[PDB]
Amino acid sequence: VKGPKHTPRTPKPRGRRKTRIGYVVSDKMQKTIVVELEDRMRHPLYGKIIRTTKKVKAHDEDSVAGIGDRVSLMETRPLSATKRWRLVEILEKAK
Amino acid sequence: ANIKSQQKRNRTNERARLRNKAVKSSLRTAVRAFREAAHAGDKAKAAELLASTNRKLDKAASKGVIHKNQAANKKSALAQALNKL
Amino acid sequence: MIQQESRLKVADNTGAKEILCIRVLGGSSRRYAGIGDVIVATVKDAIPGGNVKRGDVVKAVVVRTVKERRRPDGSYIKFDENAAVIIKPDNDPRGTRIFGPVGRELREKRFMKIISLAPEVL
Amino acid sequence: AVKIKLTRLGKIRNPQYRVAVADARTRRDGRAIEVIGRYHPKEEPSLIEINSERAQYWLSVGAQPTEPVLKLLKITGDWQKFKGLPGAQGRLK
RNA sequence: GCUCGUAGGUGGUUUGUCGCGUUGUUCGUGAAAUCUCACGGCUUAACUGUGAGCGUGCGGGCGAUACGGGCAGACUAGAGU
RNA sequence: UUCGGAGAUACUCGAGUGGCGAACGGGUGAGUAACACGUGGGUGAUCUGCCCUGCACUUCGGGAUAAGCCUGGGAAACUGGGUCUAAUACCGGAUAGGACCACGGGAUGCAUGUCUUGUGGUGGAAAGCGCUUUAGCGGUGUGGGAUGAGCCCGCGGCCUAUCAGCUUGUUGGUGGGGUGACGGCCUACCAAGGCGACGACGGGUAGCCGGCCUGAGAGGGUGUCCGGCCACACUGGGACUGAGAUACGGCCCAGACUCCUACGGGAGGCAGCAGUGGGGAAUAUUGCACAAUGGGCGCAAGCCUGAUGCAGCGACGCCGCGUG
Ligand SMILES: [Mg+2]
Ligand SMILES: [Mg+2]
Ligand SMILES: [Mg+2]
Ligand SMILES: [Mg+2]
Ligand SMILES: [Mg+2]
Ligand SMILES: [Mg+2]
Ligand SMILES: [Mg+2]
Ligand SMILES: [Mg+2]
Ligand SMILES: [Mg+2]
Ligand SMILES: [Mg+2]
Ligand SMILES: [Mg+2]
Ligand SMILES: [Mg+2]
Ligand SMILES: [Mg+2]
Ligand SMILES: [Mg+2]
Ligand SMILES: [Mg+2]
Ligand SMILES: [Mg+2]
Ligand SMILES: [Mg+2]
Ligand SMILES: [Mg+2]
Ligand SMILES: [Mg+2]
Ligand SMILES: [Mg+2]
Ligand SMILES: [Mg+2]
Ligand SMILES: [Mg+2]
Ligand SMILES: [Mg+2]
Ligand SMILES: [Mg+2]
Ligand SMILES: [Mg+2]
Ligand SMILES: [Mg+2]
Ligand SMILES: [Mg+2]
Ligand SMILES: [Mg+2]
Ligand SMILES: [Mg+2]
Ligand SMILES: [Mg+2]
Ligand SMILES: [Mg+2]
Ligand SMILES: [Mg+2]
Ligand SMILES: [Mg+2]
Ligand SMILES: [Mg+2]
Ligand SMILES: [Mg+2]
Ligand SMILES: [Mg+2]
Ligand SMILES: [Mg+2]
Ligand SMILES: [Mg+2]
Ligand SMILES: [Mg+2]
Ligand SMILES: [Mg+2]
């Protein structure tokens, strides 16, 4: 007879997305963008630094992007079969 | 089968499937009827049948024949369907 | 009616799927094999790795024919295929089971095992 | 349901026991959510210990202990101090 | 056999910046059991329990920029005209 | 009261209806080179029965049916017909915000978006069962936890180029459908993209792991007891109920194998605990207890538990001790 009828939600910090940066190579597939990621990691036994790349897909709510386009991205819920990323901000446009 | 409970359990399963069948036949025929109403764009019978359609859909949700998430999915679906009629 | 140089499909599981009638046993110059007549045959093709190998001279009994056969009661029996089952010299099938319907004429020719394991006898 | 059950980790001739919180639909020697005590029934009185401040947390959130653990829970007194009984004090020796 | 050259690997001197590699610290995780240290008890042992390491790795924050890397430049010593 | 039957009223309770459980639990490693596994993250894109907590409600009714009884058919397996009866089984209602739509506020961002609200118009829930006279078990609508789970992703982890072109629902988008949920998961249309020499596609092999063996370490071999994860359950394909399904001892179908038939038809799945046969050089008792713990159910006592505790056999291995 005395309770608040709504126990408030326990304050939980918002889990953040993961952001990275890469170029673009291909653009003519209709609001989809392809960012070619980069990563360097210590070779497990010979101990060298190996340069390994990626080729991954990110969203464009507006289909404007040249070739190059150092841009940044963070994860999302899948919007296609192999869609996992979203473009966030475009910097140093394709020159 | 073998277990004394298993025969009884199947005897309940047939009851469940049949009484469920009545319900999903009802709601399928009714969503088809609503599509008949909306495609014609009468907007009078289409306006007044919602009082029956969401009524039986929520009846289905309460009795658990289907689940409330897809229930909401369908009701939003036809709500936005008439929202452009 | 089955005669020499007639191919019959095999209605058993010995491995042979088609045999070629060599002789119609049951007398000199006997021409046709009806339902329940015993045939010596050569296996013209068999399943790979099967028990009964291609080019094997075997004994078989005709169990279904596409030519209609009279029963004494004036009825007739007709199948869509000519089929025989490979048998041992004691009239028991070489295989372990019979596929497809079987003419009842094998009952009074003492192919009782074949009758027993046939899916259904007409 | 989340259970506070008595999980067996002993030898043939010694039944040492170690108390945690785990889901009911789980085997004994499985993954326990968190370890909160131990129980060795071989000494003269006993060997008993419960954390006594996560046990309150689990009992408050709804981790129901089993029938051998409920007795031990009255013994450590957490049951009485969780149910508001006048015997809130622990009574072990 | 020799050369050219693709990917790749690797790269002179110097300025400023980023801090990805690298590196420092903390937090979280790295289950339990296993292995190591110390005790305790099964007559000792094998075995067990408890406390401390291990869990080399990864994620977040706060530092650094010597070296490597990105960027914006500069030099002429390498290279070419 | 016959001397061996009646008397449900009556504790007690066979057969019967309903709920929960049966998805936990145990086994095997065939398949699988894969987000299957190890490690770390995202879910503003999600589900989660019974457990805990905060708040309102239990309000009117109806109609069937099992079981039972009388009977029919069939070899049985099983099944048809006719009366009759209930319930926390089923159906109809009234009110109820955590459905929806639209229009708005107020907070925060990481974009689709998130929460708290208001207005209006629509909507959906339940139940009773016992009492030595302060024995008690319930149910329903929801907010939040706890737990379990689902999905997605970075990194890591075999051989092989005497496998170089693979991909068409493939790559993306829109509108839909579908899902618990995002998603070509599916579909209509449109464009022609995606993966790959950092090894695509293919071939071979293989359950993976904490670990175990070895080694000074790095490495090499291996994945057996235990424990975690996955996959499977005679072979292959599919749905159902239910919160929850590779649904080992559930269902549907096809296939192979063994059995009964009165030949029309049916039943079975030890990689559960044993144990049998067969292969091998070779690995065991058709035992006891629910005493303990974990689990299932019931207000409870209590019943079930080949999980579990044990016990028997094999020097099979380690340790200890004797045969002075
Ligand atoms: Mg889209
Ligand atoms: Mg039952
Ligand atoms: Mg209909
Ligand atoms: Mg939808
Ligand atoms: Mg040169
Ligand atoms: Mg060169
Ligand atoms: Mg080059
Ligand atoms: Mg370079
Ligand atoms: Mg340099
Ligand atoms: Mg000692
Ligand atoms: Mg010691
Ligand atoms: Mg130890
Ligand atoms: Mg550890
Ligand atoms: Mg010069
Ligand atoms: Mg009874
Ligand atoms: Mg089962
Ligand atoms: Mg199971
Ligand atoms: Mg095996
Ligand atoms: Mg009645
Ligand atoms: Mg009602
Ligand atoms: Mg209403
Ligand atoms: Mg109940
Ligand atoms: Mg298409
Ligand atoms: Mg679409
Ligand atoms: Mg859609
Ligand atoms: Mg294999
Ligand atoms: Mg060495
Ligand atoms: Mg394993
Ligand atoms: Mg094994
Ligand atoms: Mg088998
Ligand atoms: Mg369901
Ligand atoms: Mg079975
Ligand atoms: Mg066994
Ligand atoms: Mg042998
Ligand atoms: Mg027990
Ligand atoms: Mg118990
Ligand atoms: Mg033993
Ligand atoms: Mg010994
Ligand atoms: Mg020996
Ligand atoms: Mg020794």
Closest nucleotide to B71's CA, by C1' atom?
F99
A69 near A93, Cβ under 8 Å? Answer: yes
Q: List, in sequence order, every residue forming a beta bridge with D48; answer none if it has no partner.
A: D39
Compute the radius of gyration of chain D from its Cα atoms: 13
User: What technique determined this structure?
Assistant: cryo-EM
Q: Which two tokens stand for residue D68?
A: 């051998």
In the reported structure, the alpha carbon of residue A38 is separated from the centroid of ligand 6 by a whole-number distance in angstroms of 27
Q: What number of other Cβ atoms are within 10 A of residue D88's Cβ?
A: 13
Q: List, in sequence order, every residue forming a beta bridge with A58; answer none if it has no partner.
A: A33, A85
Residue C70, CB-side half-sphere exposure with 13 Å CA sphere: 3
D10 near D2, Cβ under 8 Å? Answer: no
Q: What are phi and psi of B41, to 5 degrees?
A: 65, 40
In the reported structure, the alpha carbon of residue C6 is separated from the centroid of ligand 27 by a whole-number distance in angstroms of 77
- Give CA–CA dist B48/B82, Å, rounded: 12
DSSP C49-106: T-SSPTT-EEEEEEEE-SS-EE-TTS-EE--SS-EEEEB-TTS-BSSS-B-S-B-GGG
Closest nucleotide to B75's CA, by C1' atom?
F100
- Grouping H, G, I as helix, E, B as strand and the rest as coil, residue D53 is coil
Q: Which of residues 37-56 of A touch strand E (CB under 7 A)?
A: 39-42, 48-49, 51
- Matching residue, tokens 């030519």: C67
Q: Which residues contact B81 (CB under 8 A, 6 or more apart)?
A: B38
- Give CA–CA dist D15/D21, Å, rounded: 19
Estimate in Å the CA C66 to C1' F39 gap, whole number: 71
- Grouping H, G, I as helix, E, B as strand and the rest as coil, residue B52 is helix
Nucleotides of F under 7 A from a protein CB: 17-26, 41-47, 49-56, 89-93, 97-102, 109-112, 115-117, 122-126, 142-148, 152-157, 170-174, 176-185, 190-196, 198, 218-219, 226-229, 240-243, 247, 249-251, 257-258, 263-265, 268-269, 292-296, 307-311
Estimate in Å the CA A92 to C1' E8 gap, whole number: 28
Estimate in Å the CA A49 to C1' E10 gap, whole number: 13
Q: Where are the alpha helices (DSSP H) in chain B?
A: 4-40, 45-48, 50-63, 68-83
Pairing of strands D2-4, D64-65: parallel
